[PDB]
Amino acid sequence: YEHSTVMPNVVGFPYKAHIERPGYSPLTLQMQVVETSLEPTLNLEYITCEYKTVVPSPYVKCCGASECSTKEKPDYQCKVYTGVYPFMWGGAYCFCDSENTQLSEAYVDRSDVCRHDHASAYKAHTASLKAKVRVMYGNVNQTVDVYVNGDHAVTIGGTQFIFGPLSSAWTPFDNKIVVYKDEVFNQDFPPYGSGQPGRFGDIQSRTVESNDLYANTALKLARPSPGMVHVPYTQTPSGFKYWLKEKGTALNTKAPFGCQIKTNPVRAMNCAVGNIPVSMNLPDSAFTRIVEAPTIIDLTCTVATCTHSSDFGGVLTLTYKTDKNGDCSVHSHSNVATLQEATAKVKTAGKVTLHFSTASASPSFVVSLCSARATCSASCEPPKDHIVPYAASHSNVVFPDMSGTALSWVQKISGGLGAFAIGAILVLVVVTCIGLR
Amino acid sequence: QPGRFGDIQSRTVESNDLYANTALKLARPSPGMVHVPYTQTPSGFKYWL
Amino acid sequence: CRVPMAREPTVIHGKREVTLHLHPDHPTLFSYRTLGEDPQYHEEWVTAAVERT
Amino acid sequence: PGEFLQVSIQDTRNAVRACRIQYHHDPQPVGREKFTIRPHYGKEIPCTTYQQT
Ligand SMILES: *[C@@H]1O[C@H](CO)[C@@H](O)[C@H](O)[C@H]1NC(C)=O
Numbered sequence: 001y002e003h004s005t006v007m008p009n010v011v012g013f014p015y016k017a018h019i020e021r022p023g024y025s026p027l028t029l030q031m032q033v034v035e036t037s038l039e040p041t042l043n044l045e046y047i048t049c050e051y052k053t054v055v056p057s058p059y060v061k062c063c064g065a066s067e068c069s070t071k072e073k074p075d076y077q078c079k080v081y082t083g084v085y086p087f088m089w090g091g092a093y094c095f096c097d098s099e100n101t102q103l104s105e106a107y108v109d110r111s112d113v114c115r116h117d118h119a120s121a122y123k124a125h126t127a128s129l130k131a132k133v134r135v136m137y138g139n140v141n142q143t144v145d146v147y148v149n150g151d152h153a154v155t156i157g158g159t160q161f162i163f164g165p166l167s168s169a170w171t172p173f174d175n176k177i178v179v180y181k182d183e184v185f186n187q188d189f190p191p192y193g194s195g196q197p198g199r200f201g202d203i204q205s206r207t208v209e210s211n212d213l214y215a216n217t218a219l220k221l222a223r224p225s226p227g228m229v230h231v232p233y234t235q236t237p238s239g240f241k242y243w244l245k246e247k248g249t250a251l252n253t254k255a256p257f258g259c260q261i262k263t264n265p266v267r268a269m270n271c272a273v274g275n276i277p278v279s280m281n282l283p284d285s286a287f288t289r290i291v292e293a294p295t296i297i298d299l300t301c302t303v304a305t306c307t308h309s310s311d312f313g314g315v316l317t318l319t320y321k322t323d324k325n326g327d328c329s330v331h332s333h334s335n336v337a338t339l340q341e342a343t344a345k346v347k348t349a350g351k352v353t354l355h356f357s358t359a360s361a362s363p364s365f366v367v368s369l370c371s372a373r374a375t376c377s378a379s380c381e382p383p384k385d386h387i388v389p390y391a392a393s394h395s396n397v398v399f400p401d402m403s404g405t406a407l408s409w410v411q412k413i414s415g416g417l418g419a420f421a422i423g424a425i426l427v428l429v430v431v432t433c434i435g436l437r
Numbered sequence: 438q439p440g441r442f443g444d445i446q447s448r449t450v451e452s453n454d455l456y457a458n459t460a461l462k463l464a465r466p467s468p469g470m471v472h473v474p475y476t477q478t479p480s481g482f483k484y485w486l
Numbered sequence: 487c488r489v490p491m492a493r494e495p496t497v498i499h500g501k502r503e504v505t506l507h508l509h510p511d512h513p514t515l516f517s518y519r520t521l522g523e524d525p526q527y528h529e530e531w532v533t534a535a536v537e538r539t
Numbered sequence: 540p541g542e543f544l545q546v547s548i549q550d551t552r553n554a555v556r557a558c559r560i561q562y563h564h565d566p567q568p569v570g571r572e573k574f575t576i577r578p579h580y581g582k583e584i585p586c587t588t589y590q591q592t
Contacts, residue, residue, distance in 0.1 A: 511574075514572050
């Protein structure tokens with residue numbers, strides 16, 4: 001047998017589905033999501049860390065001269081200074097007075113710990129949903145892992161469940177993200193080969209194990225002061241350390257629908273958005289012949305109390321005439337009131353009571369035992385507590401059912417005004433028809 | 438109330454009644470050591486001072 | 487590496503809001519956000535006893 | 540925490556030989572709290588040190 005429902009994508013909400021197969025007693029399915037994970041596909045652009053400046057000992061050519069020689073090092077500099085007289089230590093290190101040149105060079109390297117401490121620039125595309133749902137019906141209480149798209153089928157107790165594509169394509173991540181340790185930033189990073197000094201991306205690498213080492217750090221070389229051996233230089237301080245202090249606020253701190261951004265597989269968990277279509281294929285062995293279920297006649301419903309709070313704040317009592325003891329399945333035929341139970345125990349005594357949750361001041365809905373149906377109308381009162389540590393057990397359907405107190409008044413004044421208006425129209429029409437002849 | 442002036446009160450200096458509402462709470466000790474971990478709001482007299 | 491845990495604040499329920507009394511032993515980070523479509527967040531380093539609504 | 544670093548030894552003549560440089564060194568611990576000394580009751584977070592091997 002084929003059935004298809006639509007359950008909301010809310011973690012913890014108890015959804016209950018009703019299957020009416022003629023010739024069999026109805027069945028109520030319990031299924032709720034335990035956790036939900038949303039992962040995008042990431043293509044690495046480059047890897048950035050802090051740099052290391054390599055500065056060798058300077059070559060002093062006593063009584064002579066030397067020349068530069070370009071190398072293929074990252075951000076490489078080399079200079080020759082004409083007349084120097086070093087005074088190394090306890091002496092002068094040279095003998096000519098103004099025929100000595102110093103060769104100075106430096107270049108930018110990668111940090112010794114770039115494997116452990118680095119960021120990562122990514123590109124994020126279409127994301128794949130994957131939830132975890134517990135199914136309860138009859139005598140089975142399984143929970144399964146499923147991909148939320150129309151291309152995965154799981155089997156619980158001989159039934160086939162396919163959880164269809166979610167109704168919306170919302171994603172928290174943007175097209176460009178940065179991932180540092182446990183935190184993700186919706187950041188627009190410079191392209192490869194386009195970094196600037198003292199900002200994020202001043203040195204870039206294609207992969208943690210690459211060798212390219214692109215570098216733009218504005219390294220500049222200066223002339224040694226007279227009488228001392230040293231190579232001075234100037235460089236803009238690392239842009240990775242600047243970013244570690246200026247990187248705004250993470251995605252973890254700000255993310256709609258209470259998403260929780262997580263570790264090495266970049267994912268946003270437990271986002272409350274969208275609807276999840278579900279399709280089922282139930283075997284015949286999961287049903288019950290009507291010749292084995294209690295026959296219930298003349299069901300009536302009366303509500304004892306109702307409080308439109310987040311919890312199960314309503315109680316209703318059902319009276320019936322049965323013929324044997326047994327268990328039926330109860331259900332509400334509207335989303336303006338959520339039952340707590342899937343089954344009841346039917347006795348000859350003629351009494352059964354159920355708890356429900358609502359947000360309406362005056363709900364109205366249909367309840368059904370295993371065979372018969374009744375209509376419940378209630379007048380609910382607001383709660384008095386302001387803050388609760390849990391989420392609503394209802395769908396925020398507030399609009400009150402007609403024949404309630406609020407809309408009965410509207411109908412009454414509408415009827416009065418309409419009667420007055422039609423009286424005016426009738427009087428005018430009669431007068432004008434008499435005066436028309 | 439805890440952390441505000443008057444979290445502990447005595448009717449007189451030498452009395453022995455001592456109302457106290459300092460939100461004292463108690464916690465499970467860490468695995469493998471002997472200590473009594475707890476948390477409570479710091480004194481409201483020092484806050485008032 | 488071991489780290490401490492801040493003592494729990496004092497919560498005062500109001501109409502569509504709460505008020506917290508935060509008593510830190512040392513600079514402590516405090517943040518919040520709403521679980522809706524427009525998050526309305528805030529972060530702040532707290533160094534003394536303050537009240538936040 | 541300080542504004543410079545100084546290292547010194549004691550030579551064969553028992554004269555102090557020192558070098559002093561300018562270093563910043565303002566460290567902060569891991570987590571969301573700027574404590575100074577580890578407690579006897581707390582949490583655990585991953586940390587990086589220099590192993591003495
Ligand atoms: C199903 O199992 C879970 C955990 O094993 C339990 O908490 C839950 O109450 C069970 N459902 C029923 C209807 O007993």
